[PDB]
Design an enzyme around this catalytic site. Structure first.
Site, PDB file in Angstrom:
ATOM      1  N   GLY A  77       1.021  -1.196   0.059  1.00 58.78           N
ATOM      2  CA  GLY A  77       0.164  -0.371  -0.013  1.00 58.78           C
ATOM      3  C   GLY A  77       0.894   1.264  -0.007  1.00 58.78           C
ATOM      4  O   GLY A  77       1.838   1.108  -0.646  1.00 58.78           O
ATOM      5  N   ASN A  79       1.133   3.745   2.866  1.00 58.49           N
ATOM      6  CA  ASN A  79       1.901   3.392   4.193  1.00 58.49           C
ATOM      7  C   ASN A  79       2.317   2.299   4.474  1.00 58.49           C
ATOM      8  O   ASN A  79       3.064   2.932   5.545  1.00 58.49           O
ATOM      9  CB  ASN A  79       0.311   3.569   5.376  1.00 58.49           C
ATOM     10  CG  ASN A  79      -0.393   4.997   4.938  1.00 58.49           C
ATOM     11  OD1 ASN A  79      -1.977   4.585   5.408  1.00 58.49           O
ATOM     12  ND2 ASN A  79      -0.318   6.257   3.965  1.00 58.49           N
ATOM     13  N   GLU A 119       4.631   0.343  -3.533  1.00 60.21           N
ATOM     14  CA  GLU A 119       4.908   1.728  -3.974  1.00 60.21           C
ATOM     15  C   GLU A 119       5.397   2.533  -3.279  1.00 60.21           C
ATOM     16  O   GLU A 119       5.725   3.752  -2.539  1.00 60.21           O
ATOM     17  CB  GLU A 119       3.109   2.302  -3.183  1.00 60.21           C
ATOM     18  CG  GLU A 119       2.352   2.566  -4.101  1.00 60.21           C
ATOM     19  CD  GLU A 119       1.066   2.380  -3.797  1.00 60.21           C
ATOM     20  OE1 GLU A 119       0.997   4.176  -3.563  1.00 60.21           O
ATOM     21  OE2 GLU A 119       0.064   1.477  -3.797  1.00 60.21           O
ATOM     22  N   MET A 189      -3.542   1.845 -11.534  1.00 56.24           N
ATOM     23  CA  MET A 189      -3.944   2.118 -10.870  1.00 56.24           C
ATOM     24  C   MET A 189      -4.558   4.043 -11.309  1.00 56.24           C
ATOM     25  O   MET A 189      -3.534   5.014 -11.329  1.00 56.24           O
ATOM     26  CB  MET A 189      -3.272   2.541  -9.476  1.00 56.24           C
ATOM     27  CG  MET A 189      -3.161   1.217  -9.171  1.00 56.24           C
ATOM     28  SD  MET A 189      -1.741   1.972  -7.181  1.00 56.24           S
ATOM     29  CE  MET A 189      -0.232   1.465  -7.964  1.00 56.24           C
ATOM     30  N   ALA A 190      -5.054   4.254 -12.487  1.00 58.73           N
ATOM     31  CA  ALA A 190      -5.222   5.084 -13.473  1.00 58.73           C
ATOM     32  C   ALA A 190      -6.317   6.076 -12.567  1.00 58.73           C
ATOM     33  O   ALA A 190      -7.305   6.930 -12.559  1.00 58.73           O
ATOM     34  CB  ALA A 190      -5.674   4.966 -14.841  1.00 58.73           C
ATOM     35  N   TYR A 191      -5.166   7.290 -11.356  1.00 55.20           N
ATOM     36  CA  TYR A 191      -6.335   7.925 -10.568  1.00 55.20           C
ATOM     37  C   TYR A 191      -4.836   8.747  -9.440  1.00 55.20           C
ATOM     38  O   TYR A 191      -3.932   8.271  -9.984  1.00 55.20           O
ATOM     39  CB  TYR A 191      -7.507   7.354  -9.475  1.00 55.20           C
ATOM     40  CG  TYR A 191      -6.665   5.850  -8.824  1.00 55.20           C
ATOM     41  CD1 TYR A 191      -5.928   5.697  -7.951  1.00 55.20           C
ATOM     42  CD2 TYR A 191      -7.384   4.703  -9.330  1.00 55.20           C
ATOM     43  CE1 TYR A 191      -5.613   4.744  -7.618  1.00 55.20           C
ATOM     44  CE2 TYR A 191      -7.019   3.425  -9.006  1.00 55.20           C
ATOM     45  CZ  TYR A 191      -6.307   3.382  -7.908  1.00 55.20           C
ATOM     46  OH  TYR A 191      -5.788   2.212  -7.450  1.00 55.20           O
ATOM     47  N   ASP A 192      -5.339   9.781  -9.108  1.00 57.40           N
ATOM     48  CA  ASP A 192      -4.605  10.407  -8.166  1.00 57.40           C
ATOM     49  C   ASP A 192      -3.916  11.302  -8.947  1.00 57.40           C
ATOM     50  O   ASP A 192      -2.664  11.448  -8.377  1.00 57.40           O
ATOM     51  CB  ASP A 192      -3.979   9.369  -6.961  1.00 57.40           C
ATOM     52  CG  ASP A 192      -4.642   8.840  -6.309  1.00 57.40           C
ATOM     53  OD1 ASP A 192      -5.686   9.751  -5.753  1.00 57.40           O
ATOM     54  OD2 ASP A 192      -4.028   7.903  -6.039  1.00 57.40           O
ATOM     55  N   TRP A 337     -10.681   0.421  -7.069  1.00 60.88           N
ATOM     56  CA  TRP A 337     -10.091   1.170  -5.895  1.00 60.88           C
ATOM     57  C   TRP A 337     -11.769   2.346  -4.664  1.00 60.88           C
ATOM     58  O   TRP A 337     -11.326   3.332  -6.089  1.00 60.88           O
ATOM     59  CB  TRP A 337      -9.266   1.775  -5.905  1.00 60.88           C
ATOM     60  CG  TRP A 337      -8.775   2.147  -5.024  1.00 60.88           C
ATOM     61  CD1 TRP A 337      -9.178   3.383  -3.890  1.00 60.88           C
ATOM     62  CD2 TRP A 337      -7.866   1.429  -3.484  1.00 60.88           C
ATOM     63  NE1 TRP A 337      -8.552   3.261  -2.975  1.00 60.88           N
ATOM     64  CE2 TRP A 337      -8.042   2.160  -2.097  1.00 60.88           C
ATOM     65  CE3 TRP A 337      -7.287   0.169  -3.523  1.00 60.88           C
ATOM     66  CZ2 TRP A 337      -7.269   1.519  -1.202  1.00 60.88           C
ATOM     67  CZ3 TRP A 337      -6.942   0.224  -1.874  1.00 60.88           C
ATOM     68  CH2 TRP A 337      -6.456   0.237  -1.147  1.00 60.88           C
TER      69      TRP A 337
HETATM   70  C1  LIG Z   1      -3.359  -0.412  -4.633  1.00 58.38           C
HETATM   71  C2  LIG Z   1      -3.373   0.575  -4.450  1.00 58.38           C
HETATM   72  O1  LIG Z   1      -4.686   1.399  -4.570  1.00 58.38           O
HETATM   73  N1  LIG Z   1      -2.892   1.894  -4.073  1.00 58.38           N
HETATM   74  C3  LIG Z   1      -3.070   2.654  -3.390  1.00 58.38           C
HETATM   75  C4  LIG Z   1      -4.041   2.582  -1.597  1.00 58.38           C
HETATM   76  O2  LIG Z   1      -3.435   2.244  -0.658  1.00 58.38           O
HETATM   77  C5  LIG Z   1      -4.434   4.034  -1.793  1.00 58.38           C
HETATM   78  O3  LIG Z   1      -5.501   4.387  -1.238  1.00 58.38           O
HETATM   79  C6  LIG Z   1      -4.961   4.989   0.700  1.00 58.38           C
HETATM   80  O4  LIG Z   1      -4.212   3.919   1.333  1.00 58.38           O
HETATM   81  C7  LIG Z   1      -4.286   4.620   2.557  1.00 58.38           C
HETATM   82  C8  LIG Z   1      -2.627   3.614   3.159  1.00 58.38           C
HETATM   83  O5  LIG Z   1      -2.632   2.881   2.350  1.00 58.38           O
HETATM   84  C9  LIG Z   1      -4.983   4.943   3.446  1.00 58.38           C
HETATM   85  O6  LIG Z   1      -4.415   5.802   4.793  1.00 58.38           O
HETATM   86  C10 LIG Z   1      -5.501   6.055   1.933  1.00 58.38           C
HETATM   87  O7  LIG Z   1      -6.823   6.744   2.563  1.00 58.38           O
HETATM   88  C11 LIG Z   1      -6.222   5.348   1.542  1.00 58.38           C
HETATM   89  N2  LIG Z   1      -7.070   6.547   0.646  1.00 58.38           N
HETATM   90  C12 LIG Z   1      -7.301   6.055  -0.399  1.00 58.38           C
HETATM   91  C13 LIG Z   1      -8.795   6.974  -1.395  1.00 58.38           C
HETATM   92  O8  LIG Z   1      -8.101   5.023  -0.041  1.00 58.38           O
HETATM   93  C14 LIG Z   1      -4.649   4.679  -3.032  1.00 58.38           C
HETATM   94  C15 LIG Z   1      -5.366   6.679  -2.950  1.00 58.38           C
HETATM   95  O9  LIG Z   1      -5.179   7.464  -3.229  1.00 58.38           O
HETATM   96  O10 LIG Z   1      -3.994   4.733  -4.194  1.00 58.38           O
HETATM   97  C16 LIG Z   1      -3.633   3.348  -4.118  1.00 58.38           C
HETATM   98  O11 LIG Z   1      -2.263   3.886  -5.342  1.00 58.38           O
END
Ligand SMILES: CC(=O)N[C@@H]1[C@@H](O)[C@H](O[C@@H]2O[C@H](CO)[C@@H](O)[C@H](O)[C@H]2NC(C)=O)[C@@H](CO)O[C@H]1O
EC number: 3.2.1.14
Length: 365
Positions: A77, A79, A119, A189-192, A337
């Site tokens: 993830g 974090n 990541e 993950m075509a977002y953010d 997601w």
């Molecule tokens: C596979 C994937 O989507 N990875 C990323 C997600 O982990 C990420 O979600 C965010 O994860 C954090 C902990 O890992 C959470 O604290 C946070 O709230 C959560 N945010 C959301 C919107 O779900 C998403 C979101 O940007 O991005 C992915 O790249």
């Protein structure tokens, strides 16, 4: 086609109705359910929540109601960082420890595969060597899964990874060419693409670029990201177009200017349920009374606003479109997601259960 959907641990803690548990998962809504997330402790796959074991039991239990369903466990993830990862892949003896704990952990709770969410390899403080090692991790897991199935006579465990749409990160630690061959499928993950980390209003997941927009900012969109991975060498059948069921918010400089790309002072105020600045769940978005929905011609995506709050998200129509683009390019399917972020119980959108994801299921077939 494939419909990959993510389930998250922490959703169980949302207050009020926003609370999400496996009990709230529709076993037929997606083709593949993915559990987020699992950590690492001593180079070994390990839980991250006090009740993961009970949840693992429920999540995988859905398969009794739909045997066609496939579940995977995700490790990592945002974090999770990179420390524990870069360590585990440095030496083959620690790497092999992982590969083995993986095989046992997955076989014990009944997971059909593992999703890698590093990541990112060669980024966020990760040696530029990890790019190579990641491939080694992928190849190792790949071989172990291939071997295990032959000696256990069970259905080969699946191996996928969640890759970034960020030009940088891509060229920074992903040997697209190679890994694409050992991964059963690739979750883009075509977002953010845009966020409160930019001082000017932008959209979370834009399909195409704005007519008046170029330079490097021309890469910041789905299409670009998608065309990138395909060129780098990813057969489209193995490319899963990830889509967000949440949006991104900004606190505008003045309620006077709401131009897509307007001055923003910072992240939008946090939602009542998700409680995280710059981030809003669909079900919170559609809760805006007297809002002002609008669309971005150039990049087929909406966005509402009220006073100084400007949130760029996807609605039913933007999902219809993307599924269409998806098909157009001949991609293996869609990825979403996250489950807990759609209006999973039709409690505030007035559109029934899983509004966004149901649209996906429909269009996809
Ligand atoms: C596979 C994937 O989507 N990875 C990323 C997600 O982990 C990420 O979600 C965010 O994860 C954090 C902990 O890992 C959470 O604290 C946070 O709230 C959560 N945010 C959301 C919107 O779900 C998403 C979101 O940007 O991005 C992915 O790249």
């Amino acid at each position: 086609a494939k419909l990959v959907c993510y389930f998250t641990n922490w959703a169980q803690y949302r207050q009020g109705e926003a609370r999400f548990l496996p009990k709230d998962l529709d076993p037929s809504l997606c083709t593949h359910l993915i559990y987020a997330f699992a950590g690492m402790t001593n180079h070994q796959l390990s839980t991250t929540e006090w009740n993961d074991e009970t949840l693992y039991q429920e999540f995988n239990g859905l398969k009794k109601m739909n045997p066609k369903l496939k579940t995977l466990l995700a490790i990592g993830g945002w974090n999770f960082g990179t420390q524990k990862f870069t360590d585990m892949v440095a030496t083959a003896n620690n790497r092999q420890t992982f590969v083995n704990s993986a095989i046992r952990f997955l076989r014990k709770y009944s997971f059909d595969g593992l999703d890698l969410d590093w990541e990112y390899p060669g980024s966020q403080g990760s040696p530029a060597v990890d790019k190579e090692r990641f491939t080694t991790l992928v190849q190792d897991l790949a071989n172990a899964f291939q071997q295990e199935a032959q000696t256990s006579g069970k259905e080969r465990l699946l191996l996928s990874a969640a890759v970034p749409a960020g030009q940088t990160y891509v060229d920074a630690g992903y040997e697209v060419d190679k890994i694409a061959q050992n991964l059963d499928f690739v979750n883009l993950m075509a977002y953010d693409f845009h966020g409160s980390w930019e001082k000017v209003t932008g959209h979370n997941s834009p399909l195409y670029k704005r007519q008046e927009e170029s330079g490097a900012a021309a890469s910041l969109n789905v299409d670009a990201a998608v065309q990138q991975w395909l060129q780098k060498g990813t057969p489209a059948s193995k490319l899963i177009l990830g889509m967000p069921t949440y949006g991104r918010s900004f606190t505008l400089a003045s309620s006077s200017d709401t131009r897509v790309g307007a001055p923003a002072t910072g992240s939008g105020t946090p939602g009542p349920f998700t409680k995280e600045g710059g981030m809003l769940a669909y079900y919170e978005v559609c809760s805006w009374k007297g809002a002002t929905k609008q669309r971005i011609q150039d990049q087929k995506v909406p966005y509402i606003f009220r006073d100084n709050q400007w949130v760029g998200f996807d609605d039913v129509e933007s999902f219809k479109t993307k599924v269409s683009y998806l098909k157009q390019k001949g991609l293996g399917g869609a990825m979403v997601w996250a489950l807990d972020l759609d209006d999973f119980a039709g409690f505030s959108c007035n559109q029934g259960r899983y509004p966004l994801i149901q649209t996906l299921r429909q269009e996809l077939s």
